[PDB]
Nucleic acid binder design. Structure first.
Ligand SMILES: Cc1cc2nc3c(=O)[nH]c(=O)nc-3n(C[C@H](O)[C@H](O)[C@H](O)COP(=O)(O)OP(=O)(O)OC[C@H]3O[C@@H](n4cnc5c(N)ncnc54)[C@H](O)[C@@H]3O)c2cc1C
Length: 456
DNA sequence: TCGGCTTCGCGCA
DNA sequence: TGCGCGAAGCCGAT
Protein backbone atom coordinates (compact mmCIF):
# COMPACT_ATOMS: atom_id res chain seq x y z
CA UNK A 1 0.00 0.00 0.00
CA UNK A 2 2.38 2.71 -1.29
CA UNK A 3 5.32 4.15 0.63
CA UNK A 4 9.05 4.03 -0.15
CA UNK A 5 10.47 3.64 3.38
CA UNK A 6 7.66 1.20 4.20
CA UNK A 7 8.23 -2.54 4.54
CA UNK A 8 4.91 -4.23 3.66
CA UNK A 9 5.84 -7.25 5.81
CA UNK A 10 5.00 -5.12 8.87
CA UNK A 11 1.32 -4.93 7.83
CA UNK A 12 -1.13 -7.83 7.50
CA UNK A 13 -4.73 -7.69 6.28
CA UNK A 14 -7.26 -8.80 8.89
CA UNK A 15 -10.32 -8.21 6.69
CA UNK A 16 -10.73 -7.31 3.03
CA UNK A 17 -13.42 -5.10 1.56
CA UNK A 18 -14.19 -1.95 -0.37
CA UNK A 19 -12.22 1.06 0.86
CA UNK A 20 -14.60 3.78 1.99
CA UNK A 21 -14.43 7.47 1.13
CA UNK A 22 -13.87 8.52 4.75
CA UNK A 23 -10.82 9.13 6.92
CA UNK A 24 -8.38 6.38 7.85
CA UNK A 25 -8.82 5.43 11.52
CA UNK A 26 -5.86 4.18 13.56
CA UNK A 27 -7.09 2.10 16.50
CA UNK A 28 -4.19 2.60 18.92
CA UNK A 29 -3.97 0.01 21.72
CA UNK A 30 -0.38 -1.06 22.48
CA UNK A 31 1.96 1.56 20.98
CA UNK A 32 0.89 4.82 22.64
CA UNK A 33 3.36 7.15 20.95
CA UNK A 34 3.43 9.64 18.09
CA UNK A 35 7.05 9.12 16.97
CA UNK A 36 8.66 5.88 15.78
CA UNK A 37 5.26 4.23 15.29
CA UNK A 38 4.94 2.02 12.22
CA UNK A 39 1.20 1.64 12.80
CA UNK A 40 0.79 5.43 12.87
CA UNK A 41 3.13 5.82 9.88
CA UNK A 42 1.22 3.18 7.90
CA UNK A 43 -2.09 4.91 8.64
CA UNK A 44 -0.67 8.24 7.44
CA UNK A 45 0.59 6.90 4.10
CA UNK A 46 -2.65 5.10 3.23
CA UNK A 47 -4.61 8.23 4.12
CA UNK A 48 -2.20 10.20 1.91
CA UNK A 49 -2.90 7.91 -1.05
CA UNK A 50 -6.68 8.34 -0.71
CA UNK A 51 -6.44 12.12 -0.07
CA UNK A 52 -8.15 11.69 3.31
CA UNK A 53 -7.15 12.69 6.84
CA UNK A 54 -5.94 10.24 9.48
CA UNK A 55 -7.40 10.04 12.98
CA UNK A 56 -6.40 8.08 16.08
CA UNK A 57 -8.87 6.42 18.45
CA UNK A 58 -8.20 4.97 21.89
CA UNK A 59 -10.76 2.86 23.77
CA UNK A 60 -10.57 2.92 27.57
CA UNK A 61 -11.79 -0.48 28.75
CA UNK A 62 -12.87 -1.74 32.17
CA UNK A 63 -9.56 -3.65 32.49
CA UNK A 64 -8.11 -0.81 34.60
CA UNK A 65 -10.23 -2.03 37.53
CA UNK A 66 -8.01 -5.13 37.74
CA UNK A 67 -4.78 -3.12 38.05
CA UNK A 68 -4.00 -0.17 40.33
CA UNK A 69 -3.73 3.60 40.23
CA UNK A 70 0.01 3.36 39.53
CA UNK A 71 -0.60 1.98 36.03
CA UNK A 72 -3.73 4.09 35.44
CA UNK A 73 -2.02 7.43 36.11
CA UNK A 74 1.09 6.42 34.16
CA UNK A 75 -0.96 5.60 31.06
CA UNK A 76 -3.40 8.50 31.33
CA UNK A 77 -0.65 11.08 31.81
CA UNK A 78 1.10 9.71 28.73
CA UNK A 79 -2.13 9.91 26.74
CA UNK A 80 -2.62 13.57 27.70
CA UNK A 81 0.88 14.36 26.44
CA UNK A 82 0.30 12.24 23.33
CA UNK A 83 -2.96 14.11 22.65
CA UNK A 84 -1.11 17.44 22.46
CA UNK A 85 1.66 15.94 20.32
CA UNK A 86 -0.86 14.59 17.81
CA UNK A 87 -2.79 17.88 17.78
CA UNK A 88 0.40 19.73 16.80
CA UNK A 89 0.43 17.49 13.71
CA UNK A 90 -3.28 18.29 13.14
CA UNK A 91 -4.17 14.69 14.06
CA UNK A 92 -7.27 14.58 16.30
CA UNK A 93 -7.56 11.89 18.95
CA UNK A 94 -10.83 10.34 20.12
CA UNK A 95 -11.04 8.59 23.50
CA UNK A 96 -13.92 6.13 23.88
CA UNK A 97 -15.02 4.20 26.96
CA UNK A 98 -16.49 0.73 26.93
CA UNK A 99 -16.12 -2.53 25.06
CA UNK A 100 -13.91 -2.00 21.97
CA UNK A 101 -15.89 -4.63 20.06
CA UNK A 102 -18.91 -2.31 20.31
CA UNK A 103 -17.35 1.16 20.53
CA UNK A 104 -14.99 0.75 17.56
CA UNK A 105 -17.78 -0.65 15.36
CA UNK A 106 -20.09 2.20 16.38
CA UNK A 107 -17.32 4.75 15.77
CA UNK A 108 -16.43 3.38 12.33
CA UNK A 109 -20.03 3.68 11.10
CA UNK A 110 -20.81 7.04 12.72
CA UNK A 111 -17.65 8.72 11.40
CA UNK A 112 -17.89 6.89 8.03
CA UNK A 113 -14.32 5.59 8.12
CA UNK A 114 -12.78 4.09 5.00
CA UNK A 115 -9.89 2.05 6.39
CA UNK A 116 -9.17 0.70 9.89
CA UNK A 117 -5.65 0.08 11.22
CA UNK A 118 -4.51 -1.24 14.60
CA UNK A 119 -1.23 -2.24 16.23
CA UNK A 120 -0.29 -5.81 17.14
CA UNK A 121 -0.56 -7.52 20.53
CA UNK A 122 -0.45 -11.31 21.05
CA UNK A 123 -2.60 -11.10 24.20
CA UNK A 124 -5.80 -13.14 24.19
CA UNK A 125 -8.16 -10.24 24.89
CA UNK A 126 -6.80 -8.26 21.92
CA UNK A 127 -7.70 -11.04 19.48
CA UNK A 128 -11.23 -11.29 20.90
CA UNK A 129 -11.84 -7.59 20.29
CA UNK A 130 -10.43 -7.90 16.75
CA UNK A 131 -12.86 -10.72 15.90
CA UNK A 132 -15.80 -8.70 17.23
CA UNK A 133 -14.75 -5.68 15.16
CA UNK A 134 -14.39 -7.72 11.96
CA UNK A 135 -17.96 -8.98 12.40
CA UNK A 136 -19.24 -5.41 12.76
CA UNK A 137 -17.45 -3.55 9.96
CA UNK A 138 -17.46 -3.65 6.16
CA UNK A 139 -14.27 -1.64 5.43
CA UNK A 140 -10.69 -2.99 5.18
CA UNK A 141 -9.02 -3.84 8.50
CA UNK A 142 -5.22 -3.87 8.79
CA UNK A 143 -2.86 -4.91 11.59
CA UNK A 144 0.68 -3.54 11.92
CA UNK A 145 3.43 -4.85 14.22
CA UNK A 146 4.67 -1.58 15.73
CA UNK A 147 6.22 -3.17 18.84
CA UNK A 148 8.80 -5.65 17.50
CA UNK A 149 11.74 -4.80 15.25
CA UNK A 150 10.93 -7.90 13.19
CA UNK A 151 7.18 -8.60 12.74
CA UNK A 152 6.04 -11.40 15.02
CA UNK A 153 4.52 -13.42 12.18
CA UNK A 154 7.76 -12.91 10.22
CA UNK A 155 10.35 -13.88 12.85
CA UNK A 156 8.93 -17.39 13.28
CA UNK A 157 5.90 -19.40 12.20
CA UNK A 158 5.91 -21.60 15.31
CA UNK A 159 6.47 -21.55 19.05
CA UNK A 160 10.21 -21.30 19.76
CA UNK A 161 11.61 -23.74 22.30
CA UNK A 162 14.69 -21.76 23.36
CA UNK A 163 16.54 -18.52 22.69
CA UNK A 164 19.39 -20.31 20.90
CA UNK A 165 16.85 -21.52 18.32
CA UNK A 166 15.18 -18.10 17.96
CA UNK A 167 18.36 -15.99 18.05
CA UNK A 168 19.72 -16.88 14.55
CA UNK A 169 16.30 -16.32 12.96
CA UNK A 170 15.95 -12.85 14.49
CA UNK A 171 19.50 -11.65 13.78
CA UNK A 172 19.34 -12.90 10.19
CA UNK A 173 16.36 -10.59 9.57
CA UNK A 174 17.91 -7.57 11.34
CA UNK A 175 19.53 -5.92 8.26
CA UNK A 176 16.14 -5.91 6.51
CA UNK A 177 13.94 -4.69 9.37
CA UNK A 178 16.34 -2.54 11.42
CA UNK A 179 15.86 0.80 9.70
CA UNK A 180 15.37 4.45 10.55
CA UNK A 181 11.87 5.83 11.07
CA UNK A 182 10.47 8.40 8.62
CA UNK A 183 8.98 11.58 10.02
CA UNK A 184 5.23 11.62 10.65
CA UNK A 185 3.72 13.96 8.07
CA UNK A 186 0.96 16.22 9.46
CA UNK A 187 -2.59 16.02 8.17
CA UNK A 188 -3.69 18.25 5.30
CA UNK A 189 -7.42 17.92 6.07
CA UNK A 190 -8.80 18.65 9.54
CA UNK A 191 -12.10 16.77 9.91
CA UNK A 192 -14.25 12.47 25.95
CA UNK A 193 -12.17 14.70 28.22
CA UNK A 194 -9.23 12.70 29.57
CA UNK A 195 -9.29 14.74 32.79
CA UNK A 196 -12.74 13.43 33.72
CA UNK A 197 -11.71 9.84 32.93
CA UNK A 198 -8.62 10.28 35.11
CA UNK A 199 -10.71 11.61 38.01
CA UNK A 200 -13.41 8.95 37.63
CA UNK A 201 -10.89 6.12 37.42
CA UNK A 202 -8.90 7.25 40.46
CA UNK A 203 -12.04 7.40 42.61
CA UNK A 204 -13.00 3.87 41.53
CA UNK A 205 -9.57 2.43 42.36
CA UNK A 206 -9.07 4.48 45.54
CA UNK A 207 -10.47 1.83 47.95
CA UNK A 208 -8.14 -0.84 46.50
CA UNK A 209 -4.95 1.20 46.96
CA UNK A 210 -1.92 -0.36 48.67
CA UNK A 211 -1.76 1.32 52.08
CA UNK A 212 0.67 1.21 54.99
CA UNK A 213 -0.21 0.85 58.68
CA UNK A 214 -0.95 4.58 59.10
CA UNK A 215 -3.17 4.70 55.98
CA UNK A 216 -0.34 6.01 53.78
CA UNK A 217 -0.05 4.65 50.23
CA UNK A 218 3.03 2.61 49.41
CA UNK A 219 3.48 3.69 45.78
CA UNK A 220 6.16 6.30 45.10
CA UNK A 221 5.22 7.95 41.77
CA UNK A 222 8.32 10.16 41.34
CA UNK A 223 10.61 7.33 40.21
CA UNK A 224 9.33 7.26 36.60
CA UNK A 225 7.84 10.28 34.85
CA UNK A 226 5.35 9.10 32.20
CA UNK A 227 5.18 10.33 28.63
CA UNK A 228 6.92 10.11 25.28
CA UNK A 229 9.32 12.95 26.11
CA UNK A 230 10.36 11.45 29.46
CA UNK A 231 10.90 8.07 27.78
CA UNK A 232 13.43 9.73 25.49
CA UNK A 233 15.36 11.18 28.45
CA UNK A 234 15.51 7.76 30.12
CA UNK A 235 16.96 6.26 26.92
CA UNK A 236 19.62 8.99 26.66
CA UNK A 237 20.77 8.68 30.27
CA UNK A 238 21.06 4.90 29.92
CA UNK A 239 23.35 5.12 26.88
CA UNK A 240 25.47 7.94 28.32
CA UNK A 241 25.71 6.75 31.93
CA UNK A 242 24.63 3.12 32.35
CA UNK A 243 25.14 1.22 29.08
CA UNK A 244 28.89 0.79 29.66
CA UNK A 245 28.43 -1.03 32.99
CA UNK A 246 25.26 -2.89 31.99
CA UNK A 247 27.09 -6.12 31.18
CA UNK A 248 28.84 -6.37 34.54
CA UNK A 249 26.13 -5.02 36.87
CA UNK A 250 22.82 -6.06 35.27
CA UNK A 251 22.40 -8.77 37.92
CA UNK A 252 23.18 -6.46 40.87
CA UNK A 253 19.93 -5.06 42.32
CA UNK A 254 21.88 -2.74 44.64
CA UNK A 255 23.09 -0.77 41.60
CA UNK A 256 20.75 1.31 39.42
CA UNK A 257 22.31 0.07 36.19
CA UNK A 258 19.24 -1.11 34.27
CA UNK A 259 17.71 0.92 31.46
CA UNK A 260 14.41 1.42 33.35
CA UNK A 261 12.66 1.40 29.97
CA UNK A 262 10.12 -1.35 30.72
CA UNK A 263 7.22 0.93 31.81
CA UNK A 264 7.61 3.05 28.67
CA UNK A 265 8.20 0.00 26.46
CA UNK A 266 5.14 -1.81 27.83
CA UNK A 267 2.82 1.15 27.21
CA UNK A 268 4.43 1.85 23.84
CA UNK A 269 5.62 5.30 24.90
CA UNK A 270 8.99 4.51 23.27
CA UNK A 271 9.87 2.21 20.37
CA UNK A 272 12.29 -0.63 21.08
CA UNK A 273 13.43 -0.26 17.46
CA UNK A 274 14.42 3.34 18.22
CA UNK A 275 16.30 2.12 21.30
CA UNK A 276 18.00 -0.61 19.27
CA UNK A 277 18.89 2.01 16.66
CA UNK A 278 20.57 4.17 19.30
CA UNK A 279 22.26 1.25 21.07
CA UNK A 280 23.64 -0.25 17.84
CA UNK A 281 24.98 3.23 17.08
CA UNK A 282 26.76 4.02 20.37
CA UNK A 283 30.43 3.30 21.05
CA UNK A 284 30.37 1.39 24.35
CA UNK A 285 31.49 -1.89 25.89
CA UNK A 286 31.00 -4.61 23.24
CA UNK A 287 30.12 -7.10 25.96
CA UNK A 288 27.57 -4.72 27.46
CA UNK A 289 26.00 -3.95 24.08
CA UNK A 290 25.56 -7.65 23.29
CA UNK A 291 24.10 -8.28 26.75
CA UNK A 292 21.54 -5.47 26.38
CA UNK A 293 20.64 -6.18 22.74
CA UNK A 294 19.88 -9.80 23.66
CA UNK A 295 17.41 -8.65 26.33
CA UNK A 296 15.57 -6.10 24.17
CA UNK A 297 15.63 -8.11 20.91
CA UNK A 298 15.83 -11.84 21.64
CA UNK A 299 14.08 -12.19 24.99
CA UNK A 300 11.57 -9.38 24.45
CA UNK A 301 10.36 -10.51 21.02
CA UNK A 302 10.43 -14.21 21.94
CA UNK A 303 7.92 -13.32 24.68
CA UNK A 304 5.61 -12.16 21.90
CA UNK A 305 6.39 -15.37 20.00
CA UNK A 306 5.50 -17.37 23.12
CA UNK A 307 2.16 -15.64 23.71
CA UNK A 308 1.21 -15.46 20.03
CA UNK A 309 1.58 -19.20 19.38
CA UNK A 310 0.51 -20.39 22.87
CA UNK A 311 -3.03 -19.21 23.69
CA UNK A 312 -2.62 -20.77 27.14
CA UNK A 313 0.55 -18.80 27.86
CA UNK A 314 -0.66 -18.14 31.44
CA UNK A 315 -1.57 -21.75 32.21
CA UNK A 316 0.19 -24.88 33.42
CA UNK A 317 -0.57 -26.47 30.02
CA UNK A 318 1.98 -24.28 28.20
CA UNK A 319 4.87 -25.67 30.27
CA UNK A 320 7.25 -28.08 28.49
CA UNK A 321 6.52 -31.78 28.87
CA UNK A 322 9.59 -32.52 30.99
CA UNK A 323 8.57 -29.67 33.29
CA UNK A 324 4.94 -30.78 33.57
CA UNK A 325 5.99 -34.36 34.33
CA UNK A 326 8.50 -33.16 36.92
CA UNK A 327 6.14 -30.77 38.70
CA UNK A 328 3.32 -33.34 38.66
CA UNK A 329 5.44 -35.96 40.42
CA UNK A 330 6.28 -33.57 43.29
CA UNK A 331 2.69 -32.40 43.88
CA UNK A 332 2.52 -34.44 47.10
CA UNK A 333 5.89 -33.27 48.42
CA UNK A 334 5.67 -31.49 51.76
CA UNK A 335 6.41 -27.80 51.40
CA UNK A 336 8.71 -26.24 53.98
CA UNK A 337 6.36 -23.24 54.10
CA UNK A 338 2.93 -22.48 52.63
CA UNK A 339 1.79 -18.87 52.21
CA UNK A 340 -1.52 -17.51 50.95
CA UNK A 341 -1.97 -14.75 48.38
CA UNK A 342 -2.47 -12.18 51.14
CA UNK A 343 0.75 -13.24 52.90
CA UNK A 344 2.72 -13.10 49.64
CA UNK A 345 1.16 -9.72 48.80
CA UNK A 346 2.12 -8.13 52.14
CA UNK A 347 5.66 -9.53 52.17
CA UNK A 348 5.04 -11.57 55.33
CA UNK A 349 7.29 -14.56 54.63
CA UNK A 350 10.29 -15.88 56.55
CA UNK A 351 12.69 -14.70 53.82
CA UNK A 352 13.92 -11.10 54.22
CA UNK A 353 15.27 -11.17 50.65
CA UNK A 354 11.91 -12.21 49.21
CA UNK A 355 10.09 -9.68 51.41
CA UNK A 356 12.52 -6.95 50.32
CA UNK A 357 11.86 -7.82 46.67
CA UNK A 358 8.11 -7.56 47.23
CA UNK A 359 8.56 -4.21 48.98
CA UNK A 360 10.48 -2.89 45.98
CA UNK A 361 7.53 -4.01 43.84
CA UNK A 362 4.93 -2.37 46.10
CA UNK A 363 6.75 0.94 46.57
CA UNK A 364 8.41 1.55 43.17
CA UNK A 365 6.31 -0.51 40.78
CA UNK A 366 9.45 -2.00 39.20
CA UNK A 367 11.22 -4.93 40.85
CA UNK A 368 14.80 -5.41 39.70
CA UNK A 369 15.28 -7.91 36.89
CA UNK A 370 17.39 -10.39 38.86
CA UNK A 371 15.22 -10.53 42.00
CA UNK A 372 12.09 -11.16 39.90
CA UNK A 373 13.32 -14.73 39.33
CA UNK A 374 14.05 -15.38 43.01
CA UNK A 375 10.67 -13.79 43.76
CA UNK A 376 8.78 -16.04 41.34
CA UNK A 377 10.73 -19.23 42.08
CA UNK A 378 10.25 -18.96 45.85
CA UNK A 379 6.52 -18.52 45.18
CA UNK A 380 6.59 -21.96 43.54
CA UNK A 381 8.52 -23.34 46.53
CA UNK A 382 6.06 -22.02 49.15
CA UNK A 383 2.68 -22.63 47.51
CA UNK A 384 0.17 -25.47 47.58
CA UNK A 385 0.53 -26.47 43.93
CA UNK A 386 2.12 -25.35 40.65
CA UNK A 387 -1.29 -23.96 39.63
CA UNK A 388 -1.58 -21.82 42.77
CA UNK A 389 1.99 -20.58 42.31
CA UNK A 390 1.35 -19.52 38.71
CA UNK A 391 -1.81 -17.59 39.54
CA UNK A 392 -0.21 -15.94 42.58
CA UNK A 393 2.84 -14.81 40.60
CA UNK A 394 0.69 -13.58 37.71
CA UNK A 395 -1.73 -11.79 40.06
CA UNK A 396 1.04 -9.94 41.92
CA UNK A 397 2.95 -9.19 38.71
CA UNK A 398 0.07 -7.58 36.83
CA UNK A 399 -1.33 -5.74 39.86
CA UNK A 400 1.86 -3.98 41.00
CA UNK A 401 4.34 -3.94 38.08
CA UNK A 402 4.24 -0.88 35.83
CA UNK A 403 5.35 -3.23 33.03
CA UNK A 404 2.81 -5.92 33.99
CA UNK A 405 -0.01 -7.36 31.90
CA UNK A 406 2.67 -7.87 29.27
CA UNK A 407 3.95 -10.77 27.14
CA UNK A 408 7.31 -10.28 28.88
CA UNK A 409 5.61 -10.91 32.23
CA UNK A 410 3.85 -14.11 31.17
CA UNK A 411 6.94 -15.47 29.43
CA UNK A 412 9.05 -14.29 32.37
CA UNK A 413 6.86 -16.10 34.89
CA UNK A 414 6.66 -19.22 32.70
CA UNK A 415 10.46 -19.32 32.59
CA UNK A 416 10.71 -19.07 36.39
CA UNK A 417 7.94 -21.54 37.26
CA UNK A 418 7.52 -23.89 34.30
CA UNK A 419 10.96 -23.70 32.74
CA UNK A 420 9.65 -22.27 29.46
CA UNK A 421 12.61 -21.34 27.23
CA UNK A 422 14.80 -23.02 29.87
CA UNK A 423 16.25 -26.50 30.45
CA UNK A 424 16.19 -29.14 33.16
CA UNK A 425 18.39 -28.85 36.25
CA UNK A 426 19.29 -30.80 39.39
CA UNK A 427 16.40 -32.84 40.76
CA UNK A 428 15.05 -31.36 43.99
CA UNK A 429 12.12 -31.65 46.36
CA UNK A 430 8.94 -29.65 45.44
CA UNK A 431 10.42 -27.81 42.40
CA UNK A 432 11.50 -31.04 40.74
CA UNK A 433 13.94 -30.37 37.90
CA UNK A 434 13.07 -26.66 37.55
CA UNK A 435 16.02 -24.27 37.90
CA UNK A 436 16.62 -23.53 41.57
CA UNK A 437 17.76 -20.28 43.18
CA UNK A 438 18.85 -19.92 46.79
CA UNK A 439 19.43 -17.09 49.25
CA UNK A 440 23.09 -18.11 49.55
CA UNK A 441 23.43 -17.92 45.77
CA UNK A 442 22.31 -14.29 45.89
CA UNK A 443 24.79 -13.54 48.69
CA UNK A 444 27.82 -14.47 46.57
CA UNK A 445 26.65 -12.31 43.64
CA UNK A 446 25.59 -9.05 45.31
CA UNK A 447 25.32 -7.38 48.71
CA UNK A 448 22.02 -8.93 49.80
CA UNK A 449 21.99 -7.01 53.10
CA UNK A 450 22.14 -3.63 51.33
CA UNK A 451 19.18 -4.63 49.16
CA UNK A 452 17.20 -5.72 52.24
CA UNK A 453 17.99 -2.55 54.20
CA UNK A 454 16.90 -0.35 51.29
CA UNK A 455 13.37 -1.79 51.43
CA UNK A 456 13.07 -2.44 55.18
C1' DT B 1 24.15 -38.70 17.69
C1' DC B 2 26.31 -35.31 19.71
C1' DG B 3 26.80 -29.89 20.90
C1' DG B 4 25.15 -26.53 24.12
C1' DC B 5 22.13 -24.41 26.20
C1' DT B 6 20.18 -16.37 29.97
C1' DT B 7 20.29 -15.37 33.58
C1' DC B 8 21.56 -22.02 38.26
C1' DG B 9 24.73 -23.64 42.75
C1' DC B 10 29.26 -24.49 44.50
C1' DG B 11 34.10 -25.19 45.28
C1' DC B 12 38.44 -22.62 44.70
C1' DA B 13 41.97 -18.64 43.96
C1' DT C 1 35.10 -11.44 43.00
C1' DG C 2 35.75 -14.56 38.47
C1' DC C 3 36.23 -19.18 36.63
C1' DG C 4 35.11 -24.17 35.72
C1' DC C 5 32.50 -28.11 36.70
C1' DG C 6 27.97 -30.49 37.86
C1' DA C 7 23.41 -31.63 36.80
C1' DA C 8 19.92 -32.55 33.62
C1' DG C 9 16.37 -32.76 28.97
C1' DC C 10 16.04 -31.61 24.30
C1' DC C 11 16.15 -28.93 19.83
C1' DG C 12 18.48 -28.79 15.57
C1' DA C 13 22.29 -29.39 12.64
C1' DT C 14 23.51 -33.64 9.88
C1 LIG D 1 9.08 -13.45 36.90
C2 LIG D 1 9.34 -12.30 35.89
C3 LIG D 1 8.37 -11.33 35.62
C4 LIG D 1 8.63 -10.25 34.78
N1 LIG D 1 7.66 -9.31 34.70
C5 LIG D 1 7.81 -8.58 33.60
C6 LIG D 1 6.73 -7.84 33.17
O1 LIG D 1 5.56 -7.84 33.82
N2 LIG D 1 6.82 -7.00 32.17
C7 LIG D 1 7.96 -6.90 31.51
O2 LIG D 1 8.07 -6.08 30.45
N3 LIG D 1 9.01 -7.70 31.81
C8 LIG D 1 9.01 -8.47 32.92
N4 LIG D 1 10.06 -9.19 33.24
C9 LIG D 1 11.16 -9.30 32.26
C10 LIG D 1 12.38 -8.48 32.69
O3 LIG D 1 12.70 -8.78 34.05
C11 LIG D 1 12.05 -6.99 32.60
O4 LIG D 1 11.92 -6.63 31.23
C12 LIG D 1 13.03 -6.02 33.26
O5 LIG D 1 13.16 -6.36 34.64
C13 LIG D 1 12.58 -4.59 33.09
O6 LIG D 1 13.59 -3.70 33.59
P1 LIG D 1 14.58 -2.95 32.61
O7 LIG D 1 13.82 -2.54 31.34
O8 LIG D 1 15.27 -1.83 33.31
O9 LIG D 1 15.63 -4.11 32.24
P2 LIG D 1 16.76 -4.14 31.13
O10 LIG D 1 17.85 -5.09 31.62
O11 LIG D 1 17.23 -2.77 30.84
O12 LIG D 1 16.01 -4.77 29.91
C14 LIG D 1 15.84 -4.04 28.68
C15 LIG D 1 14.55 -4.48 28.05
O13 LIG D 1 14.69 -5.82 27.52
C16 LIG D 1 13.49 -6.56 27.75
N5 LIG D 1 13.79 -7.64 28.68
C17 LIG D 1 14.72 -7.64 29.69
N6 LIG D 1 14.76 -8.75 30.38
C18 LIG D 1 13.79 -9.54 29.78
C19 LIG D 1 13.34 -10.85 30.05
N7 LIG D 1 13.82 -11.62 31.02
N8 LIG D 1 12.35 -11.34 29.26
C20 LIG D 1 11.86 -10.57 28.29
N9 LIG D 1 12.21 -9.33 27.94
C21 LIG D 1 13.18 -8.87 28.74
C22 LIG D 1 12.45 -5.57 28.28
O14 LIG D 1 11.72 -4.98 27.21
C23 LIG D 1 13.35 -4.55 28.98
O15 LIG D 1 12.72 -3.28 29.12
C24 LIG D 1 9.84 -10.18 34.06
C25 LIG D 1 10.76 -11.25 34.24
C26 LIG D 1 10.54 -12.26 35.17
C27 LIG D 1 11.62 -13.38 35.38
Amino acid sequence: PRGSHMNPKRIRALKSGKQGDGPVVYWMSRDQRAEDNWALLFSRAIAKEANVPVVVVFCLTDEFLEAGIRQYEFMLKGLQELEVSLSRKKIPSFFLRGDPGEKISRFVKDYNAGTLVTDFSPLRIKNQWIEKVISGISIPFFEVDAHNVVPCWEASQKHEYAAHTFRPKLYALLPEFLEEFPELEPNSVTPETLSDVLETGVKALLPERALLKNKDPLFEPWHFEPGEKAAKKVMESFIADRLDSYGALRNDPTKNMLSNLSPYLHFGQISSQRVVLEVEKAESNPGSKKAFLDEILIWKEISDNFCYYNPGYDGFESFPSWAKESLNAHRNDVRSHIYTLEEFEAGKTHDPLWNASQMELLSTGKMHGYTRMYWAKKILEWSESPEKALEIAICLNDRYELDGRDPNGYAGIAWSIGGVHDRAWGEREVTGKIRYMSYEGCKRKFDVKLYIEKYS
